[PDB]
Write a protein that binds this ligand. Structure first.
Ligand SMILES: [Mg+2]
Ligand SMILES: [Mg+2]
Ligand SMILES: [Mg+2]
Ligand SMILES: [Mg+2]
Ligand SMILES: [Mg+2]
Ligand SMILES: [Mg+2]
Ligand SMILES: [Mg+2]
Ligand SMILES: [Mg+2]
Ligand SMILES: [Mg+2]
Ligand SMILES: [Mg+2]
Ligand SMILES: [Mg+2]
Ligand SMILES: [Mg+2]
Ligand SMILES: [Mg+2]
Ligand SMILES: [Mg+2]
Ligand SMILES: [Mg+2]
Ligand SMILES: [Mg+2]
Ligand SMILES: [Mg+2]
Ligand SMILES: [Mg+2]
Ligand SMILES: [Mg+2]
Ligand SMILES: [Mg+2]
Ligand SMILES: [Mg+2]
Ligand SMILES: [Mg+2]
Ligand SMILES: [Mg+2]
Ligand SMILES: [Mg+2]
Lengths: 60, 82, 119, 23, 179
RNA sequence: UCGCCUCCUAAAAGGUAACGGAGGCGCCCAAAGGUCCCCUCAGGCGGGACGGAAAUCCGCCGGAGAGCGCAAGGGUAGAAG
RNA sequence: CGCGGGGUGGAGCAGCCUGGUAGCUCGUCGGGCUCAUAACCCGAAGGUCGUCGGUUCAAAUCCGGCCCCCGCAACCA
RNA sequence: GGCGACACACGUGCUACAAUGCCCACUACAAAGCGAUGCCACCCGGCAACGGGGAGCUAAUCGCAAAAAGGUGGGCCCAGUUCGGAUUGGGGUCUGCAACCCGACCCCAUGAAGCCGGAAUCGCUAGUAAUCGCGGAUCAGCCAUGCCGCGGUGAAUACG
């Protein structure tokens, strides 16, 4: 690289809602992150949050 | 809407030709005037001829017609833009 | 700090900073501050990064929210459109649905007034 | 405002009671 | 040089890849060369200052400052005089590729609003994969307190895999969320 | 119409006429000049936020159909770009 | 066929020379004042610029042909 | 079924665009008129609408009843906002044989136009105009912001 003009790219430690993210190798060490994904919330470990009327009215 | 626990309401002169078909073995065309009536699970698959004010409209019934009164699907006036 | 989606709120207050979330307001919120046992009248500018991650992961993982919620309302209509439902014809070709008269002001649901010509 | 049904001031106007106008 | 994905590529990506298609030679393996980020900014035509803040931002998230594309030919329908800057574009590879790529998967993508997956049809038929971003503040180095305007980029991912399924495999086992 | 340039007429050297067929010139450039090093096009197909036929990117294919300030002709990437 | 000027919202006229951006009066439409109409007042709409091709990055604008328009001219014989 | 259509045009209105203001707690001060085919105290479930029960009164006896502005304390800090409550999703509740067309109401989410309105133009001279609640008719319910009444606080200004 052209010595001078680049960002410094030191190893970092980064966080998320889960445990720490390890590798991190980044400009500006020690950043926080609202959502990283290895969760088993959020789409990895899938999980949710026609259907209704045949239940509620069925006898009533 | 319809008070829950009081129905739900299907005009029983209509229900009387569907539990007369779905739990019969005969299953074919029907032609009503009762749009005030709620719906299946026991009519879904039949073909009811609904009334608009002027004549009898055909509707096929599916599971996404969850609890819609029978006139939600046979509208009452004509526009066609211009 | 950030909540559902990102939807970063800040200074104002903590109880209102949640109105500014889509899918939440003044009711789905004032409860979820005692669910985390959190004083409302404090400000998202100052509140422990501890008590932030209760809320962040409380609400995202409580119910349908900003993204998945608008996702829900959308295909709820293409359900009513594409189906022939009356309430959904007033969508397929764009008019008021529940009740009111259309010989006068629908100018919210009907777009700005497009004058034409008189007899 | 006299038409915010979700307030005390608007429930008085409409004449109804609720969570925001109890008795 | 120890970067976790560079590690994870060699141990547990290559093996599962060799035994999945069956490779005579060690080089026939799909290898990950030259991911390239391109910020198309017509949004800086008369304002020159929009670019210099954009590039300080993009470098902050790649450890290289980008080079500046300039306008190939002059086109009228949009202002576009024939020499102007219309975007930034950085080629990063070779362990800078990785520390960028690994970061993107952990933090960036899961921070994308509503994220039901990465559409898996962007394979260009000779085994490279490109995708586009909306906002810049999904990366860790972007504070929401330095975004003067929201603007995204296109991302190229070049791969030595002669076909797309091997491109598909190389990237999946690398940890790429598809549909 | 009147001088200069390009093509054809022009009969494969040159030259060749008509109130024959068609176009340009009366400038421009301090870099659009010298040199040394480097680079290679138009176009098409696939891919890619705001990008639409064509702003930018990435892939393959592309021997010159691009470019060479301005008209045409000749020339030209093994460069004159 | 000869020279010259032109063709632009419904009418009439600018804009074209000097490429980027279509304007003025009237009319038309919606609303006012009026018992009512006109006048008057407040808003609005409305066009690819004869046409085809070329030029340029971009064409009402520059270039060629065509087409209509007005004007001038066809003398010695 | 329609009278409830919707490219649009006008009349009478309501609610607003906010800090003399919004919200929440506590706390007061009226009149008229209705109601034993009804008005429902008080208890219980319910966020609530409402539903259970149930006491009283043919009613200066009992009930609709809380009057609201105001008062007190406190929160919001000039922000399309805790202004504003239009539109739409979902969940219910009661009337009624029935609520798609086409009902009222409660709750959760949504928060739209609107930052005092061109030419024009209306009402009002005193307890009036403004602003705030309340009742009644019709009436199952109700599209009431309407109509007829009731009291609360309470201006400005008329040379001519
Ligand atoms: Mg209604
Ligand atoms: Mg209607
Ligand atoms: Mg409000
Ligand atoms: Mg009422
Ligand atoms: Mg009402
Ligand atoms: Mg009452
Ligand atoms: Mg390849
Ligand atoms: Mg010769
Ligand atoms: Mg003579
Ligand atoms: Mg009817
Ligand atoms: Mg009527
Ligand atoms: Mg009204
Ligand atoms: Mg008023
Ligand atoms: Mg009395
Ligand atoms: Mg209770
Ligand atoms: Mg009463
Ligand atoms: Mg203000
Ligand atoms: Mg606005
Ligand atoms: Mg109805
Ligand atoms: Mg008087
Ligand atoms: Mg008021
Ligand atoms: Mg009534
Ligand atoms: Mg009323
Ligand atoms: Mg009333």
């Amino acid at each position: 690289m052209k010595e001078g003009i680049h960002p410094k790219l030191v190893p970092a430690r980064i966080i998320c809602g889960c445990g720490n993210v390890i590798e991190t190798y980044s400009t500006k060490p020690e950043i926080y992150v609202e959502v990283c994904s290895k969760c088993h919330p959020f789409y990895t470990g899938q999980q949710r949050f026609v259907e209704r009327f045949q239940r509620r009215y069925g006898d009533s | 809407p319809r008070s829950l626990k009081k129905g739900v309401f299907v005009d029983d002169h209509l229900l009387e030709k569907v539990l007369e078909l779905n739990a019969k073995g005969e299953k074919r065309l029907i032609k009503t005037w009762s749009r005030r009536s709620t719906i299946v699970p026991e009519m879904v698959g039949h073909t009811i001829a609904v009334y608009n004010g002027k004549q009898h409209v055909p509707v096929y019934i599916t599971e996404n017609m969850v609890g819609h009164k029978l006139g939600e699907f046979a509208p009452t006036r004509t526009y066609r833009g211009h | 700090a950030r909540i559902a989606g990102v939807e970063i709120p800040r200074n104002k207050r903590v109880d209102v900073a949640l109105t500014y979330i889509y899918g939440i307001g003044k009711a789905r919120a004032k409860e979820a501050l005692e669910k985390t046992g959190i004083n409302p009248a404090t400000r998202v500018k100052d509140l422990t990064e501890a008590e932030v991650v209760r809320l962040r992961e409380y609400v995202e993982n409580t119910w349908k929210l900003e993204g998945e919620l608008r996702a829900e309302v959308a295909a709820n209509i293409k359900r009513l459109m594409d189906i022939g439902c009356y309430r959904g014809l007033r969508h397929r070709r764009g008019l008021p649905v529940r009740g009111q008269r259309t010989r006068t002001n629908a100018r919210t649901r009907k777009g700005p007034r497009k004058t034409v010509a008189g007899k | 405002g006299k038409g915010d049904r979700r307030t005390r001031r608007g429930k008085i106007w409409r004449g109804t009671y609720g969570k925001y106008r109890p008795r | 040089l120890d970067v976790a994905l560079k590690r994870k590529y060699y141990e547990e990506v290559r093996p599962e890849l060799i035994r999945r298609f069956g490779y005579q030679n060690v080089w026939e393996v799909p290898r990950l060369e030259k991911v390239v980020i391109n910020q198309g900014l017509g949004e800086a035509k008369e304002d020159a200052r929009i670019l210099e803040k954009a590039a300080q931002e993009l470098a902050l998230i790649t450890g290289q400052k980008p080079a500046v594309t300039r306008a190939k030919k002059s086109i009228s329908n949009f202002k576009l005089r024939k020499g102007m800057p219309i975007g930034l574009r950085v080629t990063l590879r070779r362990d800078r590729m990785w520390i960028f790529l690994e970061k993107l998967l952990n933090v960036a993508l899961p921070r994308i609003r509503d994220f039901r997956g990465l559409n898996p049809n962007s394979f260009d038929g000779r085994g490279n994969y490109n995708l586009g971003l909306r906002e810049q503040l999904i990366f860790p180095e972007i504070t929401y307190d330095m975004v003067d305007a929201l603007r995204g980029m296109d991302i190229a991912v070049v791969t030595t895999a002669e076909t797309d399924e091997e491109a598909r495999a190389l990237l999946e086992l690398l940890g790429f969320p598809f549909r």
